[PDB]
Design a protein around this ligand. Structure first.
Ligand SMILES: [Mg+2]
Ligand SMILES: [Mg+2]
Lengths: 1341, 50, 251, 50, 268
RNA sequence: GAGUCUG
DNA sequence: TCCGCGTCAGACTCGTTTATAGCATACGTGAG
DNA sequence: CTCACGTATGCTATAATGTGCTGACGCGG
């Protein structure tokens, strides 16, 4: 069972592991997230709903007035994506919000029966996400990258040494909300518990409890266990708990009943403890001297006097015991604090605490955050309540509360966003438990603690900020104004919200220009996770621990895809099957194993859930429809991996691919490649420029088709059916009745995008895949995007490669290429550059775009037309004028040499200059397109007007063909309905179709169908009119540009760049090279058959690199092409369909344990020859990642091609004709031409413009800059002798202004003498130091 | 050791160009220090022959 | 200065000077008006704050944020930082008669030679061409010589070939760790945009041709030419200065 | 790591062995980006002193 | 550790007496008659009012402290021109003065280039109009749409919105920008060649032709004279000067056709 | 200033 | 607690959003 | 020599009189 587009060309699968779950939609993250932000939910606070309910209702300070939110609505987008991109506007929907101004009476108590004003107010346009996953901001496609941040909740961490060479582990708790101040608890070397609010100055931890109204005795009752002391007759007694002592040394002789258990001064072992517990020991007699030091729990007072004998938390003595006895207390509650397990931490912290009561504690807290400002009681209560106990300033969020409750071992997941008094104490309790030794510290890098924010959460936050800025304004105006005249819209401002959101989608770090070199580049960019940007890490902040691969990254984040750069480890590609949980943690699919039998039941497990189960490996062998073949299966749990029994196994990896990301999944023999090289391989695939002829990969994986389809760059069929009309522009498909809805006309039109500019100025061209009258299913590829073959992803071009040295032409990775590659225009690449010419208005007057330009040859003006615009199709070269422009000049005081020259030619040329847009120097191309943007008031250019004539007539034609094909398709249906119950075949075709409003039949369901089709026909009739009026308006519409700018002309140049020495090429195993030489065909090593190799790569760049993938790819590539050469030979000699069928079935069903079955047969003869015609240019094979082809399978395939098992061949030198003395490995490596063309990098400068202050030449090729001669480079001249070369570089070559001109004159005069001076940067330095008020003088000789 | 040795050089143009420029220039300004330009860095700064 | 867009762009020192002048002049006013002393004091604090911001912003506590939120760049900040003026504009500089491109092998070269692209060399030796053009009387003056080069006339190539003869060019690779990271070569004019490097010196540059680039620099004076040919030439820097072992070795 | 990789490239590495490889690999690559600067700062301190 | 100029000043203001109605009247009568203490006390007591307005006037131009000090200048003018005879309270009158002086300062100091209040006031009305338009038109105001609403010239509205654009910081952008007033060595060298050639060209044409031609354009002479002004030297003619000027240029045109320029140096 | 990059 | 340090060139992009009363006399320079 | 134009300083009156983003680097002296 294969699809129509797969019947045309089938990839051979060497995979063996049946896929229980298919690769999901890859651009899932971006779409789901943003869809949640705009998604209208009544309940589920997601994006805007949440944002309004959070802020609103806003009630005035007086409390008479309030503004409340009803609902919102997005207007439809003013401009489509197309018009936005051209015009350079943001693709957005207007946000209209219903809001109700309600007013209370001040005279009545809370009478709401005064004024209720409800109206729908504009608050900004929100940018919309494209169906692909992008935003068009100011006419530029951008991607907002998902973020990775610390999840709110609690975290328990510990400086492992660091502070105090003492080497003490200081434990700490950090409570992180989603919004609010941070709450820190920490230990000190002296075991005192401290609180840092918002990581400010340190305060004793007990002070925060006093602020929450805890008495001293209540604090102690919370952290400490009590020990009772009974004073009987004269001897002291204490209530014993058998264990407590445990691992202590007995300070007294412990006697129970009459009989001595402990010996004094010996350590109490487990035997003593079980003896005491079984004997049921509750009182033990003790010496009075043991209480010296014990801490009293409660306040104990003299019942006679009523005065305090001892305060709570006070160290007892022999005399306080005596006074207590005689007062009439024969029971004393003392603290249990035995070092080791139960530490007296809070007891010691209370002694450090300078505060006494609640107020004194609140004042001290207040004085910390606001130091200086006098306390008031109202101020201190307000501040403390507004820190962690205000619904408006503190919000843990659902994820915060959930992680918080799980960390404190609760049952309930959901709860308050504000901190409860119970929360804080439980956190302190756990901190102290961890100090004692029971309980552990959580991990920060653990993905259970790192959460994903995609777009919708981030858009939501910026939108809340906008609302908060609005709330101040609103509340302010509600209080001041009269309530009754004043409506809600005069109070709201849209500009704050629009500004907050605009700044996110445009200024933000995470909003970046889409990387569009190729489909894979796009798809991988949109599934990026960045730990950087706002609310995240910085490069400075980023350590080594975060960057490295964490255990939990398994199945969630790619271990082998990260920029090799400063961002190494902070930026991460998402794994293949990975997805975001409801709370935003990453999760991965796993197959449930029940009673040892491995079900197809699939569970997505979060980072924290994964730890708990034992998960078998994907490569683990399952036994034919039940359990594991092998007894001890290789699995992983508790973050580590070993053998397990079958009964212990809970789960298993869904695919072998789930560990890897998209980009790395496309690397064939990844299994045989070093992880470093593989990283750069996956990184360079993104840099691959699409060639003129998009060539499939012979050695693929199978992700090729998934990626091409999900990227969106391919046109895919929604409805299917038969193709009515193909064109190099459009595809019209007639839909099948089964999916075709009976309401609208059932004809789908896909308009293809023709040759368009990319962000990297590469070429985007869609060509039609299918032929005229081809039957297609839903999800069939109808048109190929730029770097896609029939449905598969095609980033470059496969080539006959031989590994062997040449005469140093492949020295260090240098690449030797055959001329045949250049001839066949393979790796010829198309680039489209955009140049603008801006007519501005100056103080002197407006600039003119005339062809009438002072001092210009007829040669130049030949190419400009009436208006001063170059013609479409015109070839241009550096210095040719594209758009002629002149800047008005005022009274210009010329010199005697200039006045004598202007007199000679008489070309005074009025009061105007020459500021024409001309082709940049050395770039040379053909003008493909011209666009003109004018203002509204200014009279249009003749050329602008003819452009609008074209767009108008073309628009009319487009819409007319819509209505025509839609009417024809619709009456074609009415014709079939009328035949249903009314045979009138020939009789209906003769009368005109235009007079079919009269035609009906009997009142049944079929008469109602006729009514549907008639109401749609007329609907389309008016719709066509209002569409045409819209188009006409946009074409006439004068565009509002920047202030100062009257009009803009955009020229698009087209360039065909040929492959050439200096150009950078790579494979997919991270194997790069620069092309050194293009060899004539004659010179290239050739086979026994006479066929020359395309590329000669250096053997020595393999065993060091440890990317062995490229060699396996080459052997298999040759085997693939072997079989293509056999099919090509059988097709050239026609032969039998039966014989081709035989060979091809034996081929597909080769592999030792091939998963993929292909029962050829069912294929019809016509399907088989279309298939062979595609297989002829080499049988495409798929080697999954970690479930790839084996050596033995590749050698078996080679034998099927009658190629050698070694995959080495005899080669003959093209030059000499003699044979090479040993066999050479030859085959097909799929090669990529990266964006790094020599054409773009070569730069040279003799003299140019110079910098403003420093007077040094500028930097960069765009500014025509001199190369920087850095400290390092200077030192080299210092090591040498070279003193004149150095001074040259310091002086006449850089700053020295007089020196440089004088030496230029000398060099044209041929003097080659320096005449040095003083570098100008120094004169500035002096001025800058005197500006500081330091006298810095030059002292003369 | 290296860092202090470089700051102990009796040229304040070299000391300033290395590190700690604010502190070097206050101590030189207060001492009324005179740099006679003997080392290589000093000559490279004024754009002279090494 | 006026940007092309009609807008202006200015140094942050202007914002700091304007702070200082406004507060100072307001202080003169409040002194002429005999203001109560609390207000005089506030103005004196604000005046000291403005001058301290102008001299060294960020030392006196919280730096004054301008337009973005970034602290205004003060006088001391232009001198101090690595980026100040010392490290950036003075102990190293941007340089005339300097170029770059991708490097590629030249196995045919001798050890003292390097492939230099035609168009690159045309531009670097522009004054030297102008000079010979006028001595041959082929160019009447400099602007006519410039237009002959712009037109890239056939006679100009022959002159350029004549100038480059026995003229050494410095090749540099980042990073320049030791002195052999700069070497002099006699250039060989080549059609095409890539620099051709002799294999045996690839060791000293740590040059591998997977896209590395090199700076070219033209020694102008007779002195600089001689220092390049005698001291800095490839051939003459065979042994490592760090050890007695040679650097030029076949691989 | 206590469990070594028994296999070689020719035989074929699994997802577990490959995942475990990655740690060392990326620490190496991060080392080149981050560590390069203290070496260079030592060159510069040395140069200034001599 | 109170180091901040702002917190110190606000501490000092809080430390003041708050005035009543009868107290304001008593002090105000003494103040206008010219009491020292009365003026001081009325100002010091009403500093708090300056701060309330200056606190809601931040993030628009200057800093809070800069906005408070300018506001204090309004307080002084308010105390000077307060009328205690009118039953109406001081706070009401002072509020006008404080807002006036703050706004005026914010319109001048905030922009590097001195902008007139006349234009700023016009701008205010254009922007308020834009706000009302934006609330009803889901889109934003066009220049023409604002001009229609105010019944004013489109060009005038465009000029105003053109002055709204603020200045950008060079600190970097400085290094992209290059000196446009300073010519490059190549250009300066070209001028040297021309100036040197002229001297040689003057002693190549006739003695009377290079005298008259040079001293007119100010090539050899000191001042660039005209056809009629060449008469001051020795020429003292109007027709003979014009024939001889052009005769010098015609012989020089053939000197440029033969050397190899003329149409070659016409493009230039 | 924030990016995505090549050594 | 405070402050002094952190490799060398190259490519590209973005960015400098927002606010405030109306009309009379006075001060000062420029244009016809 | 005179007026217009550009720019500035003036005065108005319900009462109102107390502030306020991003947090976390690491080694040495
Ligand atoms: Mg290696
Ligand atoms: Mg390299």
């Amino acid at each position: 069972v294969y699809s129509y587009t797969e019947k045309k060309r089938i990839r051979k699968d060497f995979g063996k592991r049946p896929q229980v779950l298919d690769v999901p939609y890859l651009l899932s993250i971006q779409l789901d997230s943003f869809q949640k932000f705009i998604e209208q939910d009544p309940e589920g606070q997601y994006g805007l709903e949440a944002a309004f309910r959070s802020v609103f209702p806003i009630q005035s300070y007086s409390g008479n007035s309030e503004l409340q939110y009803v609902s919102y609505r997005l207007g439809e987008p003013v401009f489509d994506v197309q018009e936005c991109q051209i015009r350079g506007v943001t693709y957005s929907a207007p946000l209209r919000v219903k809001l109700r101004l309600v007013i209370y009476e001040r005279e009545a108590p809370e009478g709401t029966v005064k004024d209720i004003k409800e109206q729908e107010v504009y608050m900004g346009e929100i940018p919309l996400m494209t169906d692909n996953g992008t935003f068009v901001i100011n006419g530029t496609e951008r991607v907002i990258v998902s973020q990775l941040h610390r999840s709110p909740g609690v975290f328990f961490d510990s400086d492992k040494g660091k502070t105090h060479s003492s080497g003490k582990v200081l434990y700490n708790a950090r409570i992180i909300p989603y919004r609010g101040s941070w709450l820190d608890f920490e230990f000190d070397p002296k075991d005192n518990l401290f609180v840092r609010i918002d990581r400010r100055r340190k305060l004793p931890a007990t002070i925060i409890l006093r602020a929450l109204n805890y008495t001293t005795e209540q604090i102690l009752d919370l952290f400490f266990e009590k020990v009772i002391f009974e004073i009987r007759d004269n001897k002291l007694q204490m209530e014993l708990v058998p264990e407590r002592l445990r691992g202590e040394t007995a300070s007294f002789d412990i006697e129970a009943n009459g009989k001595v258990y402990v010996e004094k001064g010996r350590r109490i072992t487990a035997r003593h403890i079980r003896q005491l517990e079984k004997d049921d020991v509750k009182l033990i007699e003790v010496p009075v001297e043991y209480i010296a030091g014990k801490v009293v729990a409660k306040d104990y007072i003299d019942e006679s006097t009523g005065e305090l004998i001892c305060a709570a938390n006070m160290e007892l003595s022999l005399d306080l015991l005596a006074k207590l006895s005689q007062s009439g207390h024969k029971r004393i509650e003392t603290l249990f604090t035995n070092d080791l397990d139960h530490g007296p931490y809070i007891s010691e912290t209370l002694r450090v605490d300078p505060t006494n009561d609640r107020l004194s504690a609140l004042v001290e807290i207040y004085r910390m955050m606001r130091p200086g400002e006098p306390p008031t009681r109202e101020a201190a209560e307000s501040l403390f309540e507004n820190l962690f106990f205000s619904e408006d300033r503190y919000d843990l969020s659902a994820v915060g509360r959930m992680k918080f409750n799980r960390s404190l071992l609760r049952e309930e997941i959901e709860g308050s966003g504000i901190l409860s008094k119970d929360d804080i104490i439980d956190v302190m309790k756990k901190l102290i438990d961890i100090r004692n030794g029971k309980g552990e510290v959580d991990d920060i890098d653990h993905l259970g603690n790192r959460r994903i924010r995609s777009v919708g959460e981030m858009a939501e936050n910026q939108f809340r900020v906008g609302l908060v800025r609005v709330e101040r304004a609103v509340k302010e105006r509600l209080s001041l104004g009269d309530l009754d005249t004043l409506m809600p819209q005069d109070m709201i401002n849209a500009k704050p919200i629009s500004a907050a959101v605009k700044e996110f989608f445009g200024s933000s770090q995470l909003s970046q220009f889409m990387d569009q070199n190729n489909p894979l580049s796009e798809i991988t960019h949109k599934r990026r996770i960045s730990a950087l940007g706002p609310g995240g890490l910085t490069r400075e902040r980023a350590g080594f621990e975060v960057r490295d691969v964490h255990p939990t990254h398994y199945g969630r984040v790619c271990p082998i895809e990260t920029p090799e750069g400063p961002n190494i480890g902070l930026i991460n590609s998402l794994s293949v099957y990975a997805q975001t949980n409801e709370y935003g943690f990453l999760e991965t699919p796993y197959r449930k194993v029940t009673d040892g039998v491995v079900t197809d039941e699939i569970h997505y497990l979060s980072a924290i859930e994964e730890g708990n189960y034992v998960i078998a490996q994907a490569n683990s062998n399952l036994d034919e429809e039940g359990h594991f073949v092998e007894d001890l299966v290789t699995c992983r749990s508790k973050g580590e991996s070993s053998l397990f029994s079958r009964d212990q196994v809970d789960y298993m990896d869904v695919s072998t691919q789930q560990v890897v990301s998209v980009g790395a999944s496309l690397i064939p023999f990844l299994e045989h490649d070093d992880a470093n090289r593989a990283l750069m391989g996956a990184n360079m695939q993104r840099q691959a420029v699409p060639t003129l002829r998009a060539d499939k990969p012979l050695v693929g994986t199978g992700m090729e088709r998934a990626v091409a389809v999900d990227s969106g760059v391919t046109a895919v069929a929604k409805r299917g059916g038969v193709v009515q009309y193909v064109d190099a522009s459009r595809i019209v498909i007639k839909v099948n009745e089964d999916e075709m809805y009976p309401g609208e006309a059932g004809i789908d039109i896909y308009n293809l995008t023709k040759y368009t500019r990319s962000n990297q100025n590469t070429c985007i061209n869609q060509m039609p895949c299918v032929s005229l009258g081809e039957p297609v299913e839903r999800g069939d590829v109808l048109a190929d995007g730029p770097s896609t073959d029939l449905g598969e992803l095609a980033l470059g071009q496969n080539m006959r490669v031989a590994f062997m040295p040449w005469n140093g032409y492949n020295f260090e990775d240098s690449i030797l290429v055959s001329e045949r590659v250049v001839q066949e225009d393979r790796f010829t690449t198309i680039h489209i550059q955009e140049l603008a010419c801006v007519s501005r208005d100056t103080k002197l007057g407006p600039e003119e775009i005339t062809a009438d330009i002072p001092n210009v040859g007829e040669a130049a003006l030949s190419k400009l037309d009436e208006s001063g615009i170059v013609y479409i199709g015109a070839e241009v070269t550096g210095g040719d004028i594209l758009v002629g422009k002149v800047t008005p000049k005022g009274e210009t005081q010329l010199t005697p040499e200039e006045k004598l020259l202007r007199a000679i030619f008489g070309e005074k040329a009025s009061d105007v200059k020459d500021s024409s847009l001309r082709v940049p120097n050395g770039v040379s191309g053909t003008v493909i397109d011209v666009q003109v943007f004018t203002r509204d008031g200014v009279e249009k250019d003749k050329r602008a007007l003819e452009i609008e004539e074209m767009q108008l007539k073309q628009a009319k034609k487009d819409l007319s063909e819509e209505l025509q094909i839609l009417e024809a398709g619709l009456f074609s249906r009415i014709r079939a309905v009328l035949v249903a119950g009314g045979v009138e075949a020939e009789k209906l075709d003769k009368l005109p179709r235009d007079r079919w409003l009269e035609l009906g039949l009997t009142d049944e369901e079929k008469q109602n169908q006729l009514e549907q089709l008639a109401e749609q026909y007329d609907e389309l009739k008016h719709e066509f009119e209002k569409k045409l009026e819209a188009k006409r308006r946009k074409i006439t519409q004068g565009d509002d540009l920047a202030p100062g700018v009257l009009k803009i002309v955009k020229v698009y140049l087209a360039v065909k760049r040929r492959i050439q020495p200096g150009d950078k090429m790579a494979g997919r195993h991270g194997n790069k090279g620069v092309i050194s030489k293009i060899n004539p065909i004659e010179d290239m090593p050739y086979d026994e058959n006479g066929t020359p190799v395309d590329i000669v790569l250096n053997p020595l760049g393999v065993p060091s690199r440890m990317n062995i993938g490229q060699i396996l790819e080459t052997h298999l590539g040759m085997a693939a092409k072997g079989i293509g050469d056999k099919i090509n030979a059988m097709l050239k000699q026609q032969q039998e369909v039966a014989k081709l069928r035989e060979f091809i079935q034996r081929a597909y069903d080769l592999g030792a344990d091939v998963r993929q079955k292909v029962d050829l047969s069912t294929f019809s003869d016509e399907e088989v020859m279309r298939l062979a015609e595609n297989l002829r240019k080499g049988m495409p094979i798929a080697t999954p990642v970690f479930d790839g082809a084996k050596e033995a399978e590749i050698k078996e395939l080679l034998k099927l091609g009658d190629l050698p098992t070694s995959g080495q061949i005899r080669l003959y030198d093209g030059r000499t004709g003699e044979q090479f003395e040993r066999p050479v490995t030859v085959g097909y490596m799929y090669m990529l031409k990266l964006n790094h063309l020599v054409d773009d990098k070569m730069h040279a400068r003799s003299t140019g413009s110079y910098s403003l202050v420093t007077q040094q030449p500028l930097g960069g090729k765009a500014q025509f800059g001199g190369q920087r001669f850095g400290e390092m480079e200077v030192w080299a001249l210092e090591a040498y002798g070279a003193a004149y070369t150095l001074q040259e570089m310091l002086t006449v070559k850089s700053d020295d202004v007089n020196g440089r001109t004088k030496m230029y004159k000398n060099i044209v005069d041929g003097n080659h003498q320096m005449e040095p001076g003083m570098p100008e940067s120094f004169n500035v330095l002096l001025k800058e130091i005197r500006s500081l008020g330091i006298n810095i003088e030059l002292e003369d000789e | 050791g290296i860092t202090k040795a470089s700051l102990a050089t009796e040229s304040f143009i070299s000391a300033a160009s290395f590190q700690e420029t604010t502190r070097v220039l206050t101590e030189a300004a207060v001492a009324g220090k005179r740099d006679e330009l003997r080392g290589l860095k000093e000559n490279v700064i004024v754009g002279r022959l090494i | 200065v006026p940007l092309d867009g009609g807008r202006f762009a200015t140094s942050d020192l202007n914002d700091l000077y304007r702070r200082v002048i406004n507060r100072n002049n307001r202080l003169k006013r409040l002194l002429d008006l005999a203001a109560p002393d609390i207000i005089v004091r506030n103005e004196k604090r604000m005046l000291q704050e403005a001058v301290d911001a102008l001299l060294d912003n960020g030392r006196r506590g919280r730096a004054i944020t301008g337009s973005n939120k970034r602290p205004l760049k003060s006088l001391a900040d232009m001198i101090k930082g690595k980026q100040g003026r010392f490290r950036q504009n003075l102990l190293g500089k941007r340089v005339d008669y300097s170029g770059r491109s991708v490097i590629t092998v030249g196995p045919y070269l001798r050890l003292h030679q390097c492939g230099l692209p035609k168009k690159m060399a045309l531009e670097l030796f522009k004054p030297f061409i102008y000079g010979k053009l006028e001595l041959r009387g082929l160019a009447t003056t400099i602007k006519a010589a410039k237009k002959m080069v712009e037109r890239e006339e056939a006679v100009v190539w022959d002159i350029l070939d004549e100038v480059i003869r026995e003229h050494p060019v410095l090749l540099n690779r980042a990073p320049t760790l030791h002195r052999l990271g700069i070497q002099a070569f006699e250039p060989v004019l080549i059609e095409g945009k890539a620099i051709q490097l002799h294999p045996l010196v690839c060791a000293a540059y740590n040059a591998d041709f997977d896209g590395d680039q090199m700076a070219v620099h033209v020694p102008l004076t007779l002195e600089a030419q001689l220092e390049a040919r005698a001291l800095m030439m490839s051939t003459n820097n065979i042994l490592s200065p760090a050890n007695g072992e040679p650097i030029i070795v076949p691989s | 790591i206590e469990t070594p990789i028994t296999a070689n490239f020719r035989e074929g590495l699994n997802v577990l062995q490959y995942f475990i490889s990655t740690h060392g690999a990326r620490k190496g690559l991060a080392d080149t980006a981050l560590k390069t600067a203290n070496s260079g700062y030592l060159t510069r301190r040395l140069v200034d002193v001599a | 550790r109170v180091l901040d100029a702002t917190q110190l000043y606000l501490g000092e203001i809080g430390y003041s007496p708050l005035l009543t109605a009868e107290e304001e009247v008593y002090f105000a009568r003494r103040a206008l008659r010219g009491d020292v203490a009365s003026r001081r006390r009325m100002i010091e007591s009403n500093l708090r009012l300056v701060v309330k307005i200056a606190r809601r006037y931040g993030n628009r131009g200057l800093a809070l402290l800069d906005l408070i000090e300018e506001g204090n200048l309004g307080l002084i003018r308010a105390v000077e021109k307060f009328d205690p005879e009118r039953g109406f309270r001081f706070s009401t009158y002072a509020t006008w003065w404080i807002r006036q002086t703050i706004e005026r300062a914010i319109m001048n100091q905030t922009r590097t280039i001195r902008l007139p209040i006349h234009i700023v006031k016009e701008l205010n009305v254009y922007l308020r109009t834009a706000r009302e338009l934006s609330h009803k038109l889901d889109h934003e105001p066009s220049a023409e749409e604002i001009a229609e609403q105010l019944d004013k010239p489109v060009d005038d509205v465009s000029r105003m919105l053109r002055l709204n654009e603020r200045g950008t910081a060079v600190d970097a952008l400085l290094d992209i920008l290059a000196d446009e007033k300073e010519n490059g060595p190549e250009d300066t060298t070209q001028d040297d060649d021309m100036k040197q050639s002229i001297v040689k060209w003057l002693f190549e044409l006739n003695a009377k032709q290079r005298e008259v031609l040079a001293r007119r354009f100010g090539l050899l002479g000191y001042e660039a004279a005209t056809l009629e002004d060449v008469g001051r030297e020795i020429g003292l003619t109007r027709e003979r000067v014009r024939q001889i000027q052009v005769e010098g240029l015609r012989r020089l045109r053939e000197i440029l056709q033969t050397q190899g320029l003329n149409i070659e140096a016409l493009f230039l």
